[PDB]
Amino acid sequence: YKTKPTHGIGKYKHLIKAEEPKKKKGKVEVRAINLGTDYEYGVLNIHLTAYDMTLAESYAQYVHNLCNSLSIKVEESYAMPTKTIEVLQLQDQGSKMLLDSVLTTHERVVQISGLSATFAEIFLEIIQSSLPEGVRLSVKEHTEED
Amino acid sequence: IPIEDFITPLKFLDKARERPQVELTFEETERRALLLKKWSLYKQQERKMERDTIRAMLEAQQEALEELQLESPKLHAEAIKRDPNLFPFEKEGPHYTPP
Amino acid sequence: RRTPPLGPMPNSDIDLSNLERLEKYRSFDRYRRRAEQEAQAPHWWRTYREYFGEKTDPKEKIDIGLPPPKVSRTQQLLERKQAIQELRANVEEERAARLRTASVPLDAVRAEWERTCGPYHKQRLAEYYGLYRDLFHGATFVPRVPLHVAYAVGEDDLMPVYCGNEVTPTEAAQAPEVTYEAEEGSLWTLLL
Amino acid sequence: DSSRASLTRVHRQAYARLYPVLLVKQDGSTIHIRYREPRRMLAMP
């Protein structure tokens, strides 16, 4: 009841903040909160690309579990479409004929939100030390449309 | 507009009679289970080493930040804030053979 | 018109700021464990446990029995570690565990249960049936020595009285075969 | 530390064979690439 000592004992929506907003076409990015004594970066991108698919998938799983274990939030994880590259082989003796062979390229993306600068440098070095064989890392910014 | 490439092609349906055969024995399955047990313990060991290094490095950095805050009232304001040198940060992976 | 609470509000200890840096219940059984943990506490509002006949249980109950025999838990723990290490040495046990085919010697675990922790289980069964409520007006004890009473009807079988069994009066026609361990310095009073 | 993510399985369900070709880059550097049609050296110019 409203006058009893147990008023508001069944309150729950002051615990769940999720307003269920349109989280598909919204572009309300969080900005870099920088106080000098309190630097905190926003919604930086992480790119992992390779010609091998399963290595990129495995390292994306690794970095996802790593940032999940260190309590820094994952915004979204998704992938770009693949690119395919031809090695148009010039013939050895008569170099006017151009034979061809096939090769591929994949890409994976994770996003991180909370980064103090000390944890930023320790985070990027600890990813960079455990960087697997064959991929390239690139910490880019947020305005990356497909 | 997103372009998806997790679609398997429509050619992947028909020729589906090449390797359905799996005929194994008991020694191979016990070998594979024992190897998965060994690899589980090994990966737990690696993750423990990784966590201990991360925690020791973090307490080292925090000890440094505390001593800088004690000894100098102005250098922490520039020392904490992240300079824009590392905006397009990247690093290419290792190799197998040297040049 | 309001009235303040008579104590702490239940979901007040968590902080409403920094919600996204809190750990959520990722499952249903985690919340279930927390809620059935919380429902056992003595709350200050009105609850189900107050009204529905719990006999006002908090009051210490008098023990009248034999003391527990002293064991050195360090040696016991190291010997049990030795035993399970010796069992873990065998590899056919690992094959039986992986291959989903490994039973237990039920008679051995029965005698061992009679040997180690069985008295406390028989104590709580005897308190569930209301024996200590009607035999000693609430005063409780532990059945320290094991006991085996078996009834005699036919030629081969038995109908034993374990703790809480069901035996028909035709099977209780004659005096049963009572046996237990005892030393040659002790006198006993049986009572049914 | 570069042994953590090198042990992988092709996690898509329907997939072809792949072979560990040794790909040499623009300075002569090898990468194990899971590529079909079991070639042994791939020179990317």
Place this chain on the structure above:
Amino acid sequence: ARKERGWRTVFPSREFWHRLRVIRTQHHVEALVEHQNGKVVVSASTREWAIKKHLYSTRNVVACESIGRVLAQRCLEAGINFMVYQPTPWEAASDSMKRLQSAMTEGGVVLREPQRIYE
């Protein structure tokens, strides 16, 4: 005797005289039999040295099967052979709980308590 009918929106239902309740820790598996007033009657847990020494890997499926067999024996010696098992769907589809219910039924202890008379 009357069962506690009702509650009709929450889980588990309180309509039983006895319940089967299994607790699956990351170390041990423990099965209880409760009365609905709350006092437990019989239990078989792998924390006990009696079941501990006779098996390996107290977490795994055959340990829960052993717990089912030992609990069925212990509760037939207690004269209680009707109880209710009320699991979540993913526990009821698990192989461990399937083989534990099989060990309970093959031990003679039947689930699905009978109806109340003039309910």
Place this chain on the structure above:
Amino acid sequence: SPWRLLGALCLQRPPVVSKPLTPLQEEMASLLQQIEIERSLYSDHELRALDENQRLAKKKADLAQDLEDMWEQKFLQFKLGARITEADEKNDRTSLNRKLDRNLVLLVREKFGDQDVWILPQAEWQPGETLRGTAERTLATLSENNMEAKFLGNAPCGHYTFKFLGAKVFFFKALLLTGDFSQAGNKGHHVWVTKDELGDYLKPKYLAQVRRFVSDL
């Protein structure tokens, strides 16, 4: 309040090759390739063996092998670059290409009047300038070459206490892109040194506690 203004830095170097693989991981890669073979289906080379030899027997009753032997020859003509640029040197501790499996940290020698110290390279910061700026400034002084050491953060790394007049030691780290080392025969004893050799070369407690925040690999 006299605090003698003293910083430091530690040079970070990326490895070039992956470390060699452990034998249980060899068995794991073997069984992973086995499970890969089992779950795989319908490669082009698989038909180019199977139904090509089938149609071969068919029209004989009336490719693959040549190209795979060609690929064996294309393997055997190209000897790969040998990973061991380590045992053929065995001596050149001053070289950038000595060790490539692991990460390395540089350290310079100067025996002072009162002190005698093998130093991880220091910095002497001036009250008008910033800490990391003095780190890269002394890095421009101490190296006498062109190198691109990309820094990792504005935050320092490890702080220590020596007092004789108080003082302190302020550490920094920076990842190397490429080392274009001029005057490789320097007598200022800079040395490219791994973690085990770091623990070897250190005498004091001031350098022993450094190893906790370098990457142990």
Place this chain on the structure above:
RNA sequence: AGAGUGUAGCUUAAAAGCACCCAACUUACACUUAGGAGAUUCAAUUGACGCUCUGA
């Protein structure tokens, strides 16, 4: 050299409960299923092993 001390990572747990790791499902995470390893530093509440802070 002095001081605080003491169960695996945590616990006003007494050999426990959470943490933790691998496989399967998921782009991935998360849920769930199926597995994995774990501890009272020793000597008779007292004494001499390890760590931490202060020293020089």
